């Protein structure tokens, strides 16, 4: 059950993430 074993990217996503979690705060 290890979580972070390299990820297949999750590059992109992270910057939109940082947008619904931005506006809101």
Do not use: E, F
């Amino acid at each position: 059950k290890r979580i972070g074993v390299r990820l297949p990217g999750h590059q992109k996503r992270l910057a939109y993430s940082l947008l619904g979690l931005k506006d809101q705060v």
